[model samples]
Target: KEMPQPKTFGELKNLPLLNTDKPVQALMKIADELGEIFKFEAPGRVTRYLSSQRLIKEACDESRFDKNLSQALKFVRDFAGDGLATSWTHEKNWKKAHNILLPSFSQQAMKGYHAMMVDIAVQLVQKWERLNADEHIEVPEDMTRLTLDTIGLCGFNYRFNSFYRDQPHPFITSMVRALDEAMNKLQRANPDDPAYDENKRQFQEDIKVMNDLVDKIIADRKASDDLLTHMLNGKDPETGEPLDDENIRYQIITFLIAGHEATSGLLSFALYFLVKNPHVLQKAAEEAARVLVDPVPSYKQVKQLKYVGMVLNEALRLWPTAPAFSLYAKEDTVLGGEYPLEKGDELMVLIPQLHRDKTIWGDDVEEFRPERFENPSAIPQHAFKPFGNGQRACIGQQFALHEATLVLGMMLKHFDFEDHTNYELDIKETLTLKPEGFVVKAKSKKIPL
Candidate 1:
């Protein structure tokens, strides 16, 4: 008997196993029962999904592989008309931009943003404290606001005031609409659909709102140590030429999408897992109480919270944000010694499956266990990559870890997370992995310091 395949986006969405609370586990089960590689007939093209850890590791190597994003990302170009999305660009332009902006996420750079990160995290805790004792808060929405503010303040000097405002900022509203339109357009290749033109018009309008806001912010900047400031003055490492204003604007948009959008997803999922496991929650809170002082800690002290880091790693392991990303074949080459390939063939690197591979993660691959990180030698080199691998790995890994650790520790110290609604995770399928409607109650508490 032949394995079942999804012939269209609608069919893929309808598959029970592929669309579930445990989609990653479902995908892994398919790989285990069938084969490492599975073929599907998409509406516009034929595509393949690869789940083998070793195969994926080899493909991610700088020498062996390179990427050109899938067509799904074409919507990004629509949103960023003049400037290119850095991740989706070709290698040459990507390297030039990556080199010019790499230092913005460096150690010294993160150091400058430490106080700002702490300030924003504290503001979140205070807001949660003011809520009624048993008030149920939507984790994703609240975390979204927090992370959005972080990106604006840390990524730019602009303050979104997400927490202070009753309604969302106009820019936030525009961004939300643009993503909705772009993602919907991605699912259907139909042009005759009655809504297609409407989507196009709204997307164009929303994109202008986004770009113009970024432009205004850029124009208003005087001089500071923020990431925006650094990018503006920095020279291209390869050419020594100044980056154009359009490229800088696009870079900021990319960071907005990458920094806050991605980090919020991580924070939401991590909190969900912690609340579900009481013992893990207690342990994390205890660790926070031990290391964090006065609702904030020095950069060195936050790094020392070993258990906090471990819990975060486990959360990231189970639900990596960039779950499955596209990689293109640079040349006609064979894969896994079994499959033949062609130049420009696109492959989906199934990250969730790789993270949960039984051989690499032990027998309890699906289990939520932070203990796995305690012993580094236990897992192989390329098996555990929440941020990605090789030359294209996330540049903000350190900054994200530090910010997440600091915020989680602060929340644990002052509040206890409990599942009042008993909401199951409805994983939102978008450019990033969002645990949609991941809600929990934040009951204020004072633990021993």
Candidate 2:
């Protein structure tokens, strides 16, 4: 079957003017019009968008397609250079880092990081507790603070100290600007744009701020059992190689960059859904109260908060923080056994749409229902790729889930959340999706002693 696409003139005329600020939303709009498989044409490249379960399943097959760095990720490479998230499949650093760091996310390792996770989660709870009774909590900003601090302390024994400060850390400010500019470059590809020079200069400065911080983190290290120590001291089991200092820095930046965004967004969206669906919120809180008998949950108690996990999964299904990932045909092949694909042709799996596919998610796809994820195995494997796919899937899946579950469980047990202004969800995109201007008032709850 011929794949759907805009007429050539239409493609040239309208596609470039896409709302690059919200590229995922723009692409979703395109998918709405173009159906499951469509060709997105640019001057020198033709990127395909895959939204259906069948197409994504076919694309995910290791024999046919492999992960490729999209243009945005290439821009990310300017700072996150060849880190786990941005590195090519064959990069030696990725393999070594993967091998050395894989155990850090293992079951026993999560147990090790539990205290640090609890520390940050406690900071968040305390900060909210200290807020004025009627004060609005900027959910995404604070969630970012929580995740960044958790990753910092857990990954390297470094402290972002986000909760203690009125402003975000310099690392976060610079990293955020760098990501915004990366998105900007996708729209204004031409360097000749008058604003390009100044933006590029600032982008470099932002990269430096982040790089310097990572360097400081590496230089100021003492012997501890955190991720930094692991990277510094651990050797790849297969090759018996240690990561170079530069690669270590890149991995640190990658963990800081990749670790925080999606998890923060997951929490933000979960909170939003909870507030909007009061019944669901009550049920989650009831579950939290049952499992979290103490102020802080034990690692086992955190796992016992199954409904909180369901809420996180449902949130990811609705708004996958990293909404789209690019893959390319490894060899000439037919996608979905229909659309002819050439070697190296890029195919982007639109996760939001794929998750909403009616056949898989049913008619109530738009509803906020965490129960959909209560039995994950019932859904098709490829249909719910919130963490991504195959060998390149997120290594921090368990880490992110555990942290989110703990924090969500704790929050539910200690506080009652109310929508600050009857706010409707409006997504903000910066390489990941977060609820823009979403605020909630957290009223302290009286728990039975």
Candidate 3:
């Protein structure tokens, strides 16, 4: 039941789940599902199913998630229901997302991201400069912490000091485990006998604890409001709906969760490839020095960054977050001309396969090239969909891009990453794409800031 995909080693790669980071055997689940879709029913059903979560989240935020954004946070601390973002009217929500959120994240947040990176680079190089010794750092964890911390400051007007020090809150740990495990467990749950209430209760507990910690912070603020506060309290500019607390919590959690996992994975893998290929490392460093001014690339400056965008794009292409997206055939449909399905049949679009497919990406799909995205129009919107396509695509795609470019750009200017022997990133696919252990180590390059 193959949809359009890469063929042959040139186009099609019999890659170890290691390459894409899924257990080799787990690939079957996605394939079997995609094989069930009928060509005609594919598009409509695909969209309907994909949009459900977005709609739900939107509702939770604006209509029902619980209360206001703050209370919604409280609800999350107490109960992790469905991962629903509010739904958007096709025109209103999509246009705003495309025009505002996407570019702002790409260009605006990047300034914050790049600045954070420079601070990190300066600190690491300072340690190098002062100590005159080599020290290894958990590159993955450091990068993860940085993004988590910076995103909160820039996007939500909050901070999770994950990079500077470890904290008592198990948000990252609970989230990492729960993010991968919850859906996997639920999917395995029986609708007829569905693992019933027990498992759902436990997953909900984990989600609550993770979200509650932040809710506490918002609660502490009491009367004062920041960007997030305003978003939570204000009326929906596009939907004419007032946001609720539950919805706000979900949106905040969504942004942080999305920001941390996806960007972290990309940074880890990007360095892994650079370490694997020294020439690429050298080139990235050269580009960083030339393109990134003042250690950080500003909002206006992120777009001019051709090489950095390319590196991040290739990394996302090879290992997209949420490698496969699930869909329910809204009705019988035609896809790549095969795989038929009735309304209830579920389908999975295997992005890892699409990313490497020679047909869409050409023969060198396996290799990384920053040059492909050098010109913005190099790939059609559909062909290069790391963030996904259409209305349900990630709202924070810009956020993710800005964050990644900033992390890489900062590292490029200060530290040339050299992968340690144990720097293997394990892939765990859940609501998002993350490393198996969420860990990787790299030696930093000593460039005085």
Candidate 4:
């Protein structure tokens, strides 16, 4: 069957530009007009977008389709260089690193990292504790510091000490600049422009700062049982080869970039939803108070915060930080058993639309209802992929969930959030999506009677 597409020149012109600040939102608008499966011409290419659960399920069949790095992720490859997130599926390093690092994110490994996670959380909590009641805390900014510090300490035994500084750590500033330049390069109409050269030069400098930091991390490595040690010492069991120095550098950078960005967004968005929906906030805070009777929650106690976990899940459904992923057809095949797709044809799964599919999520899909996730089995498969799909799904999924739940639970237990600005959700896109300019007045909660 022929796929749906913008039929006229005017329709083509009217289609939302995919290179905007909110690319996922752009695709979502297109999906609303063109239905579940459609194609549109972008400068030199025609790309298909899937916005329904059935289409996503068809494309997820491993026999026919595989993960394709999106254009933004390809740009990420310029600096990250064959790291786990950017490497082609067939690359040896991808598989090797995946195997070596998989155990580090295991439940057992998370147990080891729990105290360090708390250490960072305490830093954030202490910072908030010091802030005056009237002061508005920038939720995303502080969450970024919290996640970055947690990952640095847990993954590599490095310390960013983000809470101690007023500005973000240098690594964060460079990474952000480098990523912004990458997105900018995508939208640039003229490669010959003089500004392009300056941007490229600055991009390289930002990458250099990141690389220098990672290199020093490796050089200063001690006899610690962190991820760095695993990379330094781990041998691919089948090949009996350890990661080379360069790959290790890439992996470290990848962890730092991947580890913090989306998880921070998750926490920020969860807080936004909580403030907007006070009843949800009250229930989540109550759960935190009940589960965390002590000052710090134990590992097992952190796992018991199911309602808080649901809040995070609902937040992800509304604004998946890593919004969309591309899939490539391995061979000529029919998608949804209707639309013909040839080999090399690429399709993007617009996750937000899929999450908001009215048929599956119901009429109240737009509402921030955490109870929707009460039973995981009731949801359709391939319908909820906040983490990307298949073998290339996020490695740090559990780590992010655990850290967000723990920190969020702790915050709720100690503080009462107020929306001083009466803010609406405005997402700021880096490599990930986050609530932009979101601030809240978090006052310390008084003791119960």
Candidate 5:
């Protein structure tokens, strides 16, 4: 049976797959039903979505100036009246922001935060000890709380204290709600509706609180080296000026929201996959036992947990928490040297499909196997980009890996996780990709909460 192609952007709206929670699944079906290349209106403009790896590779260029249109950024910028969503900026500002923020998360900088991260992980272990063996812990929820607190303290000397309190800090609450509302606004967003109008107002109010809070953090700060210190002291090479307060605030927001969510997702999904594959889990645990002697290992020791690293990589491959972002075409070009793209048109890359490609990953693509990353060089460059690629690649790539590895290894060493065996992965598409209803039970072997 031949599939009927949607002739126009308007017809693309009528396609049911566009509205699904499982976009990668929907895109796969659509590709089978229609074809790889198609047109759809992305909130404001009619953009092209591509699924082929070849097309994706051909389009890959970290040096590109523009990011694809982000409805969330548009909403935040229009309403909140402030922020530096780097991926939402053009080349000039993006380059500057990236430059200023890069040092804040560099290898030397990340090492400075290892002690604090370990403290946070120990706190997490203590929390798990408090829960009874029968108590089903929400993996994403706890991990989110943990990472939020970790980045808050580590990133800026700010403290969310998310796990300590039953209720989230006012700042974290506002940030989460703002991002959530932005997500809702993207799909069926009613800019003219009073509902969103109130939301925008509240969002700005929240930003004001955040801005003031950051002001205090930056003001009374006697910091040696933290991301916030770096941000405060960082000068753009071209501008020779330190990041202004507004840019600083937005960069903090980006780190707080984007940083915490992605790492927590790694933890949530890693736990999910580890429990499902016991032998693999055992192997990872053994590696953890072999290497991670300190409850919170230094960055150097964390790197030594090779199998643990593989486990993390495999989890990233299966569930790239930050999957599927777009890059805008700066000029007329052909993607995969086939699809003609005009300037201003977007090329939205669907990452999940690419990660599971049978061609690159082989028939066992969908299966959870950590061995694939034993020699990462064996894989093609673009084939593995959980942290994204090129110049736009994640600034905190190693930082996040170190934190996640530390957390995972520590948990494995201290606790025996009961997968409940019934846990299912229903990814909730929040500001970052998350596992919905992802839960597990942990029994503390060494420490008692």
Candidate 6:
């Protein structure tokens, strides 16, 4: 009899390295299904989480975002007062958008934003120079630190020394690390056939450290001045529960968890693309010169700087961090007008499939062209959900857009990315989509300095 086909993912992966296609798409589908299967326990986990905290089992039982989104966000108005939450992200986000987030190109605060960005950009450039000087540069864990620090400022108007010390605040570090560990462990486990053992003892240790540290930070700052304190101490208009410790942690975790990998992925792709295409680099440079300033790339300027947005968008289209989404059938259901799904089962809405669909994205679907996002309306809605859609969407969706566009704009203005490659991280799925963390070399062209 012919030798049996490879039995598992590990075996198939080892079959042969080159001269044959790796069945890449087929492997990815299996990868996604494996992710959903393991997380089946999580919605139950969320329910348990809620039950543990608020005597509410009904609300926590389903991992459906619709249920959780409304509840979590309504909690926001309570903590920040109708003013802050509504002001930024609410319909109220409109009012402040003109202020903090959506400043005009001429605004001085926008200048400050540019200046802060320039400082960060300078550091990135300087690091690239170090690689030029020494032929190597280690992980700028510092960049990660700076973004977290910047998040405190941009998102909450606070100061956090994310990179100031080798060992930063245990909560901040562990919070981000816990999410990473969770993802990494997913890879470590046999998703197709898990042992039901996830090294929980060590996982618990990390969670314990994060929770304990966060609790103390809250307690110590209960009477302090900061965005967090403002939310935690303030009254809720709807739920009536104070922001308290648990909700604060989750919201903070939401922002923290959104896509550390995505930012890293975008930066990696930007440099990779720029290195390969001097014309793309040239266009980005021209756009940056025309649009950027001290508070470089104000929200308005960011829009006019369409190519920069396109570059980021194209990268995302090609390699979204959370490349897939899933919906476990609550009851038997059908979708996309064709597939029939069963209750107690799932449908993996692969974003890559959607974005890469020749029918939706055209023949160049597989090609890297930031130009696709140019038409903007070109993408079919519900088909392209990088963060997600609807009220049960990412709370920090705009925040992410602002951050990525501005940051990309900064790179556009002051530097040219080179010597990078679009090395897709071996597919690794978690609470949010992530890369398996690969390494690359990048070179930056300093702005006429």
lDDT of 5: 0.73
What is the lDDT of every predicted structure here?
0.75, 0.89, 0.52, 0.88, 0.73, 0.47
Indicate the TM-score of model 6.
0.65
lDDT per residue, candidate 5, 142-232, as tens digits? 8988898898889877777778677667776777777666666655644677756777788677776666766677776844678887777
For 197-301, candidate 4 gives per-residue lDDT tens digits of 888888999999999989778777842677887899988887778899889989999999999999999999999999999999999999999989887789999
TM-scores for all predictions: 0.90, 0.97, 0.72, 0.96, 0.90, 0.65
* Reference-based lDDT, residue 287, model 1: 87
Model 3 worst lDDT run, 10 consecutive residues: 62-71
Question: What clash pairs does model 5 have?
Answer: none
Model 1, residue 171: distance off in Å is: 2.6
lDDT of 1 by residue, 407-434 (tens): 8888888887888877788887656787
- Two-way lDDT contest, 4 vs 5, winner: 4
Residues 170-225 of candidate 3: C-alpha lDDT, one tens digit per residue: 77777855654443432232434555566566666777776786586567556423
Candidate 2: which pairs clash? none
Better of 2 and 5 by TM-score: 2
Name the runs in model 4 displaced over 4 angstroms: 6-16, 192-195, 446-449
List candidate 2 segments past 4 Å from native: 7-14, 192-195, 447-449
Candidate 5 weakest ten by summed lDDT: 1-10
Better of 1 and 6 by TM-score: 1
- How does candidate 6 score on lDDT? 0.47
Once fitted onto the true fold, the runs of candidate 1 whose alpha carbons sit more than 4 angstroms away are 1-33, 81-92, 192-195, 447-449
Q: Between candidates 3 and 6, name the one with more favorable TM-score.
A: 3
Candidate maximizing TM-score = 2
